[PDB]
Design an enzyme around this catalytic site. Sequence first.
Site, mmCIF file in Angstrom:
data_model
loop_
_atom_site.group_PDB
_atom_site.id
_atom_site.type_symbol
_atom_site.label_atom_id
_atom_site.label_comp_id
_atom_site.label_asym_id
_atom_site.label_seq_id
_atom_site.Cartn_x
_atom_site.Cartn_y
_atom_site.Cartn_z
ATOM 1 N N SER C 140 0.561 -1.198 0.582
ATOM 2 C CA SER C 140 0.208 0.364 -0.009
ATOM 3 C C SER C 140 0.915 1.068 0.487
ATOM 4 O O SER C 140 1.397 1.299 0.395
ATOM 5 C CB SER C 140 -0.927 0.257 0.761
ATOM 6 O OG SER C 140 -2.280 -0.517 0.780
ATOM 7 N N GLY C 144 3.781 2.707 5.759
ATOM 8 C CA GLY C 144 5.008 3.158 5.959
ATOM 9 C C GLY C 144 5.661 1.861 5.314
ATOM 10 O O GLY C 144 6.182 1.340 4.530
ATOM 11 N N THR C 145 4.902 0.244 6.263
ATOM 12 C CA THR C 145 5.691 -0.479 5.280
ATOM 13 C C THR C 145 5.823 -1.253 4.099
ATOM 14 O O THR C 145 6.581 -1.762 3.781
ATOM 15 C CB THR C 145 4.809 -1.420 7.086
ATOM 16 O OG1 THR C 145 4.871 -1.381 8.182
ATOM 17 C CG2 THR C 145 6.187 -3.494 5.916
ATOM 18 N N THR C 179 -7.189 7.532 5.696
ATOM 19 C CA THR C 179 -6.826 7.299 6.459
ATOM 20 C C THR C 179 -5.949 7.874 7.671
ATOM 21 O O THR C 179 -6.082 8.427 8.936
ATOM 22 C CB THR C 179 -6.688 5.612 7.409
ATOM 23 O OG1 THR C 179 -5.304 6.234 5.833
ATOM 24 C CG2 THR C 179 -7.539 5.189 6.187
ATOM 25 N N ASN C 206 -10.493 2.757 -1.975
ATOM 26 C CA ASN C 206 -11.404 2.586 -0.905
ATOM 27 C C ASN C 206 -12.853 3.581 -1.809
ATOM 28 O O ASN C 206 -13.890 2.421 -1.112
ATOM 29 C CB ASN C 206 -11.034 2.052 0.179
ATOM 30 C CG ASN C 206 -9.766 2.095 0.457
ATOM 31 O OD1 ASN C 206 -8.615 2.892 0.419
ATOM 32 N ND2 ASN C 206 -9.901 0.353 0.284
ATOM 33 N N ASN C 228 -11.277 -6.712 0.566
ATOM 34 C CA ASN C 228 -10.495 -8.380 0.490
ATOM 35 C C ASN C 228 -11.388 -9.109 -0.734
ATOM 36 O O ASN C 228 -10.990 -9.477 -1.533
ATOM 37 C CB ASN C 228 -9.869 -8.550 1.539
ATOM 38 C CG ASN C 228 -9.209 -7.721 2.860
ATOM 39 O OD1 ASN C 228 -9.981 -6.415 2.113
ATOM 40 N ND2 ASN C 228 -8.423 -8.345 2.926
ATOM 41 N N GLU C 254 0.752 -12.879 -22.471
ATOM 42 C CA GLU C 254 -0.110 -12.215 -23.156
ATOM 43 C C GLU C 254 -0.570 -10.758 -23.423
ATOM 44 O O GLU C 254 -1.146 -10.108 -24.136
ATOM 45 C CB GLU C 254 -0.826 -13.730 -23.703
ATOM 46 C CG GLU C 254 -0.141 -15.102 -23.942
ATOM 47 C CD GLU C 254 0.241 -14.765 -25.025
ATOM 48 O OE1 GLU C 254 -0.177 -14.371 -26.003
ATOM 49 O OE2 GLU C 254 0.897 -15.641 -25.457
#
Lengths: 50, 432, 439
Positions: C140, C144-145, C179, C206, C228, C254
Amino acid sequence: KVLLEREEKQKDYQARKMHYLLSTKQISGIYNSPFREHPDPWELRLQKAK
Amino acid sequence: MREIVHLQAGQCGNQIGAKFWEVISDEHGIDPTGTYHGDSDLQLERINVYYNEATGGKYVPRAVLVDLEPGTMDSVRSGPFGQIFRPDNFVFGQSGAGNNWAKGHYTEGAELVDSVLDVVRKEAESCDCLQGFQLTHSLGGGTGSGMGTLLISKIREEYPDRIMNTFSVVPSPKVSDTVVEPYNATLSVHQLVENTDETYCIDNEALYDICFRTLKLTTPTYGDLNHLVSATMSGVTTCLRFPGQLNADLRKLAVNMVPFPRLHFFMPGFAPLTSRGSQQYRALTVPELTQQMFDAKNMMAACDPRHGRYLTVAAVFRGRMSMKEVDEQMLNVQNKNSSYFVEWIPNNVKTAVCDIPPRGLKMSATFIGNSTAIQELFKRISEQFTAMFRRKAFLHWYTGEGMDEMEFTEAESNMNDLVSEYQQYQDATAEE
Amino acid sequence: MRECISIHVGQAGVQIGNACWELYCLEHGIQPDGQMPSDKTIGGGDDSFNTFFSETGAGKHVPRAVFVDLEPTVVDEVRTGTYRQLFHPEQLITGKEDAANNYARGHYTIGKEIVDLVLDRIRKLADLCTGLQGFLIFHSFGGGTGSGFASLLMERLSVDYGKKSKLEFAIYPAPQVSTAVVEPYNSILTTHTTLEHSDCAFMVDNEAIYDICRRNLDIERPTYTNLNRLIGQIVSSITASLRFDGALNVDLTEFQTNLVPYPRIHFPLATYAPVISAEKAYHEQLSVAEITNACFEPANQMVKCDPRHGKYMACCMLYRGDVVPKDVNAAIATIKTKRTIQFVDWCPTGFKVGINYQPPTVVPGGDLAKVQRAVCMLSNTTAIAEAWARLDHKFDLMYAKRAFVHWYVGEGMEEGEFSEAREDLAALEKDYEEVGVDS
């Protein structure tokens, strides 16, 4: 000499269009290659002003 | 003796070849096991053209399947007749073509090509004397068009004295499957006109229209297209498979039908295309067949032959009717419709009747002719290619492979020359 | 053969991978234990599961995916779940410190500590496979991760494997709702890395998911689970011809070959259909033409952009289920003559035909109903360039006074990184504008 100036002017509006054809991303483009050079008198113009 | 070696390329090519093999097996009476269950007379003598003699009377197919994706052999093998072929011929690579002609020709066309050359050389050496090689592929992808041209070039270089006939699929702007399809078509046409004896045009959209408006099928699918093209090739090949009174071969057609090597394209077509409910209500006669072989509704063209002039025509029949009717029909057609064929060359239609009727149908007749109806396809292909090549879109993929852009320039120059030649031969005036 | 490796970075990436794996196991009849205990009544499973799963000597299935995250809390949350017996703990790497919506720490002081371990993991996973085509990197831009670590890992994966496809899947900060606050701070730096070091990038948000769910599914109480589920269905539809076959198989290569007209412009517009609830799938006749027309509606797009502002250059057409070619041809004929849909004066046509014999399945307790066929669209248009314009404007207004910049300065990074990122985004927008301009 104004004709020569036009010739010089004939280099800058080129940089207008082929700004979007700068093919250097991903180290995989059209004009350039690991065998066919980095932007040069032709390809140096593909990066210049608007 | 005189046998024909069959070649395969492209997933569409693979499926149509499999359908053709199934059709010929059913009509000649071969069980899915591999033995012989036929009950005819001519289905044993000349049966060796596409088969090979083995122990226990178990004939084996003669067709090499060439591909880059292993997922096609699994699909075609699971069919009711997929266990009869030679697994050794299923030469598939590890990397797909990605609908790329340059990448498939360069990367997947160097280390895999040797095996298929070895196997085809073995097959040719296995027989005594051969006539030609049949390759069924499509231009829609990097598989058929990517290596079929290379294989044809290699076999022509090795064996010049052979027949190069193919049934490649022409594209259509209305019905597309590849974004870079015009690029692949432009690249392939150069090889088709440089290193190919003859070529037949194949369009899916025209067959879809034909079935929708005449066959009146509920859910037409690719299986129907494969059946129709298989019947087309069977009618084409019955001249040598089942000799009759006036038999012919591929090379006599290719010589008599092609006035100039630069123009070797044709127009196939089959006569009896009727709906399911119309099969029990029909009059089997010559004039009906002549009308259905002459009209533009029955041909499988995504174009109109009436915009130009007929160049060369062959009427290949399969049945037991007559000889006088064909010639009188052709004569009155040329007399009445005098403005649809070249006046400079009289008698542009060839007579050919196969005395052996097909299995399951009594009357059958195909149409092989070269009318002036491909020029619009050529010009639209040239226009779209120029449109794509102006700003050079989708070009980084081909350039990153290693090949330059001058190939496109020479290809489009050749296309311009070819279309100019075609248009200035369309108006073939008698004199000044 | 057609085998790919999935990469999951951040909490969103991990949960998305969990949804994808559970969808695959339910659709393939794979039991959560890892073996085939259905010895009394079989319910499927005799297919080619080698694409994603692996077969052991004792009849066990090992998932092939990368579950890396800094904050150990997500790893613990998944570990205490009911699917803990399927995967392996070595594939879920924990961590002491976490970025938590921060790039500088996560790219310099936290990212460079766990490198050799994940590289050895991915090397082992690749060696365990025979054929590799592309990767499934899930992250995402807000997290931060999922930004600094994703960037630093992909910068090495690109230089270690130049012949392998590098996909991208993440979340866009919606201009209306968000967020966090420092989301564009990470986005401006992640976009440069994903543009100049990757091949294709998929972008979604979202807010559009919320709008479509409240409009079609008619739910007042949304949750991340359905979010999800939608993404998992999208991914399954995309890679449908790999696990199975059909009339015209469409592999990764392809389509990705044609999905990139210029590696500047590799940001397609995905559109899933039908997105409907159970009651929305009973008294509604479903054909191909209607859903294909609905695919071009801006209301059903997962990116808030009016397609009528620009035009299309490249288009990718996919299907899944009992689809008849005649309906596809009729829909193509209908859309090619539609005046509302705009397109460039140079590409008369472009699309693909992916026919999948296996219909999409359902999940007990989910919201998706049993639909006979599915359809997905990946088009390329310049009307989506507004999102980057808004992002650049926000970055400019929030960088003039240097809001929340001293933290990144203290962490250690050169402050120009904002300037060349801004000018790269400006040049990319200029290129998009110029391409969108016809003759």
